[PDB]
Design an enzyme around this catalytic site. Sequence first.
Site, PDB file in Angstrom:
ATOM      1  N   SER A   1      34.856  44.790  48.067  1.00  0.00           N
ATOM      2  CA  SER A   1      35.873  44.371  49.086  1.00  0.00           C
ATOM      3  C   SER A   1      37.177  44.900  48.610  1.00  0.00           C
ATOM      4  O   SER A   1      38.332  44.413  48.743  1.00  0.00           O
ATOM      5  CB  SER A   1      35.976  43.078  49.278  1.00  0.00           C
ATOM      6  OG  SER A   1      34.817  42.627  50.070  1.00  0.00           O
TER       7      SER A   1
ATOM      8  N   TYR B   1      25.318  46.691  40.511  1.00  0.00           N
ATOM      9  CA  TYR B   1      25.303  48.010  40.765  1.00  0.00           C
ATOM     10  C   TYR B   1      24.661  48.856  39.704  1.00  0.00           C
ATOM     11  O   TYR B   1      24.185  50.044  40.024  1.00  0.00           O
ATOM     12  CB  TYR B   1      26.838  48.117  41.092  1.00  0.00           C
ATOM     13  CG  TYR B   1      27.266  47.463  42.040  1.00  0.00           C
ATOM     14  CD1 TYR B   1      26.818  47.749  43.481  1.00  0.00           C
ATOM     15  CD2 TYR B   1      28.334  46.648  42.248  1.00  0.00           C
ATOM     16  CE1 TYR B   1      27.012  47.314  44.640  1.00  0.00           C
ATOM     17  CE2 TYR B   1      28.859  46.110  43.553  1.00  0.00           C
ATOM     18  CZ  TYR B   1      28.064  46.357  44.425  1.00  0.00           C
ATOM     19  OH  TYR B   1      28.711  45.586  45.976  1.00  0.00           O
TER      20      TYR B   1
ATOM     21  N   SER C   1      30.130  48.193  51.199  1.00  0.00           N
ATOM     22  CA  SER C   1      31.211  47.386  51.486  1.00  0.00           C
ATOM     23  C   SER C   1      32.359  48.262  51.090  1.00  0.00           C
ATOM     24  O   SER C   1      32.406  49.275  51.796  1.00  0.00           O
ATOM     25  CB  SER C   1      31.245  46.044  50.338  1.00  0.00           C
ATOM     26  OG  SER C   1      32.444  45.366  49.964  1.00  0.00           O
TER      27      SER C   1
ATOM     28  N   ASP D   1      38.424  35.494  54.190  1.00  0.00           N
ATOM     29  CA  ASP D   1      38.234  36.355  53.218  1.00  0.00           C
ATOM     30  C   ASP D   1      38.330  37.794  53.471  1.00  0.00           C
ATOM     31  O   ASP D   1      38.927  38.521  52.627  1.00  0.00           O
ATOM     32  CB  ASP D   1      37.114  35.811  52.128  1.00  0.00           C
ATOM     33  CG  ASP D   1      35.637  36.194  52.539  1.00  0.00           C
ATOM     34  OD1 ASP D   1      34.687  35.476  53.115  1.00  0.00           O
ATOM     35  OD2 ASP D   1      35.477  37.486  52.569  1.00  0.00           O
TER      36      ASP D   1
ATOM     37  N   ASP E   1      25.801  40.747  59.117  1.00  0.00           N
ATOM     38  CA  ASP E   1      27.272  41.105  58.472  1.00  0.00           C
ATOM     39  C   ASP E   1      27.918  40.816  59.791  1.00  0.00           C
ATOM     40  O   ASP E   1      27.908  41.665  60.655  1.00  0.00           O
ATOM     41  CB  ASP E   1      27.194  42.420  57.848  1.00  0.00           C
ATOM     42  CG  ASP E   1      28.536  42.852  57.273  1.00  0.00           C
ATOM     43  OD1 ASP E   1      28.672  43.961  56.641  1.00  0.00           O
ATOM     44  OD2 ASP E   1      29.673  42.157  57.836  1.00  0.00           O
TER      45      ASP E   1
HETATM   46  C1  GA3 Z   1      34.068  37.439  49.247  1.00  0.00           C
HETATM   47  C2  GA3 Z   1      33.014  38.161  49.443  1.00  0.00           C
HETATM   48  C3  GA3 Z   1      32.617  39.501  49.074  1.00  0.00           C
HETATM   49  C4  GA3 Z   1      31.259  39.593  49.450  1.00  0.00           C
HETATM   50  C5  GA3 Z   1      31.388  39.246  50.878  1.00  0.00           C
HETATM   51  C6  GA3 Z   1      31.932  37.795  50.484  1.00  0.00           C
HETATM   52  O1  GA3 Z   1      32.526  37.064  51.804  1.00  0.00           O
HETATM   53  C7  GA3 Z   1      30.715  36.708  49.635  1.00  0.00           C
HETATM   54  C8  GA3 Z   1      29.867  37.720  49.033  1.00  0.00           C
HETATM   55  C9  GA3 Z   1      30.467  39.057  48.283  1.00  0.00           C
HETATM   56  C10 GA3 Z   1      29.277  39.799  47.850  1.00  0.00           C
HETATM   57  C11 GA3 Z   1      29.049  39.747  46.582  1.00  0.00           C
HETATM   58  C12 GA3 Z   1      28.470  40.919  45.706  1.00  0.00           C
HETATM   59  C13 GA3 Z   1      28.272  42.294  46.486  1.00  0.00           C
HETATM   60  O2  GA3 Z   1      29.254  42.854  45.527  1.00  0.00           O
HETATM   61  C14 GA3 Z   1      28.636  42.265  47.828  1.00  0.00           C
HETATM   62  C15 GA3 Z   1      28.982  43.585  48.451  1.00  0.00           C
HETATM   63  C16 GA3 Z   1      27.790  41.323  48.816  1.00  0.00           C
HETATM   64  O3  GA3 Z   1      26.661  41.841  49.053  1.00  0.00           O
HETATM   65  O4  GA3 Z   1      28.057  39.955  48.830  1.00  0.00           O
HETATM   66  C17 GA3 Z   1      29.975  41.387  48.115  1.00  0.00           C
HETATM   67  C18 GA3 Z   1      30.814  41.145  49.379  1.00  0.00           C
HETATM   68  C19 GA3 Z   1      31.491  42.423  49.651  1.00  0.00           C
HETATM   69  O5  GA3 Z   1      32.332  42.801  48.791  1.00  0.00           O
HETATM   70  O6  GA3 Z   1      31.931  42.717  50.605  1.00  0.00           O
END
Ligand code: GA3
Length: 321
Positions: free
Chosen positions: A91, A102, A166, A218, A264
């Site tokens: 994010s 990764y 993401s 978030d 999602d």
């Molecule tokens: C605060 C976050 C960031 C998430 C969404 C969430 O709301 C909860 C889970 C995070 C996350 C964790 C690890 C990975 O980098 C990601 C892409 C995912 O699948 O889930 C991550 C994902 C993201 O970066 O989009």
Amino acid sequence: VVPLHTWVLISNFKLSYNILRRADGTFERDLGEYLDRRVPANARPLEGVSSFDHIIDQSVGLEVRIYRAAFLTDAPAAEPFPVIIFFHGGSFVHSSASSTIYDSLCRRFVKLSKGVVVSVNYRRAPEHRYPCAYDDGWTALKWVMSQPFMRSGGDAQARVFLSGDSSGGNIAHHVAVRAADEGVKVCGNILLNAMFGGTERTESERRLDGKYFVTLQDRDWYWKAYLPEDADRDHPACNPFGPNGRRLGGLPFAKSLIIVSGLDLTCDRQLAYADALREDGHHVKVVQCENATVGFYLLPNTVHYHEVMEEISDFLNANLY
Ligand SMILES: C=C1C[C@]23C[C@@]1(O)CC[C@H]2[C@@]12C=C[C@H](O)[C@@](C)(C(=O)O1)[C@H]2[C@@H]3C(=O)O
């Protein structure tokens, strides 16, 4: 439902990340770095893949991790092979090319592609706002194209695919646009739950909010962290085909493989993104994984995981020549 291991892994991230975001829009960066699960690069092959860390732009400390089956000076390969330039998710704020989730995914990409993966450690928000992550992706594309080792086939050129999940899918897109504007050839983009946004909520946003790990609160926070201080979610970095957007008709834009989790909450935006690309005359293949949550490509434990690895391999093979 969500497999238990997925639920436990993604919830561990969710709950940890909850304590790192500050209400004032700053981030617990030192604690974030300390709590992340990471691995080193290793020249010795594990399950047949080696990795190497390398700084490619000193001015901003920009590092990549290079993965290959098991040197940058070596001659171009006779036979075409893909180079996948990968931008990690998180994010715009979290994770690194060294993050184990990764590192693991890039290793799988090497096995899948029989090619090279270049994972970019782009500068992260909120410390580094727009457009730093895009700048770093452009820097990495140009660097890859310039290395003799990365080049292959008759025309001896790097056969580049830009990929990311993401925030990394968002970055891959903007780098691809910049490439098309400068007449740099990209063979394909591979977007996994690419992160896009807008000032209004979509149906999927309202319906899925809070149900499968991700919350609108978030998502809003991360956009606020990356976008300029004076901007909103209709900034084109966030909403590339929204009211301040730009259509891409006429550009030599990459073909796209667009992978979307049905669970999602931003799925609507991803599909509308794909629709816009088609509308502009570009080639798009959309893989909707209806039963999948964010992160599903990280654990080999669902049909969607397998399906998507196969779609990725087919896309690479189809777009290599
Ligand atoms: C605060 C976050 C960031 C998430 C969404 C969430 O709301 C909860 C889970 C995070 C996350 C964790 C690890 C990975 O980098 C990601 C892409 C995912 O699948 O889930 C991550 C994902 C993201 O970066 O989009």
